[PDB]
């Protein structure tokens, strides 16, 4: 019999040898209990509902609370939100004159001098023009929420976290893979702890995900209703590489008592923005299979893909993180295909702007600074799922666009199987 309860978190036998207690907390006292056993059971059928389930809010609340409480003992950045007089008189590259190089401020530093002229390098989207002349600039985030530097001890990777139910409770993941997560399923594989779910945050795409059963599938609410958020899982994993080619200089400006703030020095090497590569043949075959299976859901009219509309930076870009740096890739040309009703060559590339200061989450709360790192950075992963969203017009073309509009749609793609009884 189903009920409402609160679960716990577990981990594997991997432990932090650097002993970063703060992020070690993810597995600091969480028991490893690495004994995953499976069982099979028969005579169970029931209307499963992945949209109205119980533990996705549990996952979202603990992920956001872990991200908030991982930064409390770290340094507070608060005395840096001051006037920024940024000049940009010289130009090693033409795209640097808009509020990037030698952006100087009058800072009272550690040595008790009130007006030291100290400069830094910043990104033009991360800065805003103050209401007046163009000679002064302001940080886009300290207007809204308090900014906080990230410590070196909170350097994060996706740990394949495990959920275990307490005594007197059980969890059921239905074996049927074709199950759309909305309706009567069949014979039940029963475990006490699920397989690993990595807490990766992403928009419009699923990276380092879980593969399918052998062919792609389309899941959502019952077709009887007007489905909007459609999560598409794929059987053919597609490699994605995203890289930045510039070595960077890391400088130290002391603003806290006895601790350090790290800022960006000069760019070393030939300067370009971030760029990502997708194999054209696998992408074309992937979209062909997605269209040819999505046709039987709506077997009357044409379907098409469109890039996302505006409103903020996250919906307009593919947003992810690699190496402690946040990447916003355009991805507009990847969804311009249109279809009709009734193995790696000529690779496609996409631009990708990088970010330093993120608004992060909990606007009743704090916000993040990301310190820079040196060296050319390559980040390779596999894409598994899509987060397209449906709209319908008066014409015979059903439009789709990457989206979803919630982080809970990211967790719900892998947590659809489980409910508590």
């Amino acid at each position, epitope marked *: 019999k189903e009920a409402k309860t609160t679960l716990f978190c577990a981990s594997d036998a991997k432990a932090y040898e650097k002993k970063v207690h703060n992020v070690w907390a993810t597995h600091a006292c969480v028991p490893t209990d690495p004994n995953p056993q499976e069982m099979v059971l028969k005579n169970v059928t029931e209307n499963f509902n992945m949209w109205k389930n119980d533990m996705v809010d549990q996952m979202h609340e603990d992920v956001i609370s872990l991200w908030d409480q991982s930064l409390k003992p770290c340094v507070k950045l608060t005395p840096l939100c001051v006037t920024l007089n940024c000049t940009n008189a010289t130009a090693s590259n033409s795209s640097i004159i808009e509020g990037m190089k030698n952006c100087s401020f009058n800072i009272t530093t550690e040595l008790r001098d009130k007006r030291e002229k100290k400069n830094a390098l910043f990104y033009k989207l991360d800065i805003v023009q103050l209401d007046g002349n163009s000679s002064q600039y302001r940080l886009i985030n300290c207007n809204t929420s308090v900014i906080t530097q990230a410590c070196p001890k909170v350097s994060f990777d996706p740990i394949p976290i495990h959920y275990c139910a307490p005594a007197g409770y059980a969890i059921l993941k239905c074996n049927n893979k074709t199950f759309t997560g909305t309706g009567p399923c069949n014979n039940v594989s029963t475990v006490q702890c699920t397989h690993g779910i990595k807490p990766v945050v992403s928009t419009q795409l699923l990276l380092n995900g879980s593969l399918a059963e052998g062919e792609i599938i389309i899941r959502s609410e019952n077709i009887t209703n*007007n489905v909007k958020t459609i999560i598409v899982h794929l059987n053919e994993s597609v490699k994605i590489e995203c890289t930045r080619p510039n070595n960077k200089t890391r400088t130290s400006i002391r603003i806290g008592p006895g601790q350090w703030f790290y800022a960006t020095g000069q760019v070393i090497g030939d300067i370009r923005e971030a760029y990502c590569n997708i194999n054209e043949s696998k992408w074309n075959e992937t979209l062909q299979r997605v269209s040819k299976k999505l046709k039987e859901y709506f077997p009357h009219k044409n379907i098409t893909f469109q890039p*996302s*509309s*505006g409103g903020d930076l996250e919906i307009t870009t593919h947003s992810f993180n690699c190496g402690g740096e946040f990447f916003y890739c355009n991805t507009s040309s990847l969804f311009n295909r249109t279809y009709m009703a009734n193995n790696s060559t000529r690779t496609i590339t996409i631009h990708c702007r990088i970010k330093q200061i993120i608004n992060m989450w909990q606007e009743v709360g704090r916000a993040m600074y990301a310190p820079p790192i040196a060296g050319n950075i390559t980040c390779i992963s596999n894409i598994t799922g899509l987060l397209l969203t449906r709209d319908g017009g*008066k014409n015979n073309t059903e439009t789709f666009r990457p989206g979803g509009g919630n982080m809970k749609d990211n967790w719900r793609s892998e947590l659809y199987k489980y409910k508590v009884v």
Partner: antibody
Amino acid sequence: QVHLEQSGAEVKEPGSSVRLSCEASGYTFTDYYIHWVRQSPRQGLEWMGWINPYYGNTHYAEKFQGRVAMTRDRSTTTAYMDLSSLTSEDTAVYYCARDEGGSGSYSYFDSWGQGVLVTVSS
Amino acid sequence: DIQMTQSPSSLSASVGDTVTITCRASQDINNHLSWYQQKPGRAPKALIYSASSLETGVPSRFSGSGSGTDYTLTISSLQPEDFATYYCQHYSTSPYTFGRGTKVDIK
């Protein structure tokens, strides 16, 4: 126990804009959508548009494209609407709407606010 | 665009009897339909949705039926605070469109 609250309004001039604000309480604000509707004599209940409160993406009406602007604010949990370039037919009462089936299949909206008159005069 | 028509704006009724109200659509709106009960001076509330399933707190006096391009609502043994106007709204697709509304009045 979900509640929508919006305040009063006063007279504005044609060719100008108007500011409308609504706030939500009871249920978590980031999990459904916010709709805007309009009531007036001699007209029906014309649809204005809908807004995702978590993200910035919106959807508009083809009759009212360019004359309206939308804004979410998750800090104060508010929805902001800006009708611009007023015309004498727009003297009407305006209503907010909380939708259901959040991030699923949006079907019918139930929770409505008080609704506020706005009148344009030169 | 999707255009609806309804019954004429005035329906004769008496307390504790049956009232049949209907509205017709022009295209395929499947069962994506809902109704609202508009009282003057007050923001209306949904009472029936998807032509079959009622909302909690709303009694069994309002029975919805129909399919395709015409939909009916039957009111059996009505009480005096159902003497207000009724609107029918489709939610098939596109920008939405509302009905014109019919009032329930005593002869």
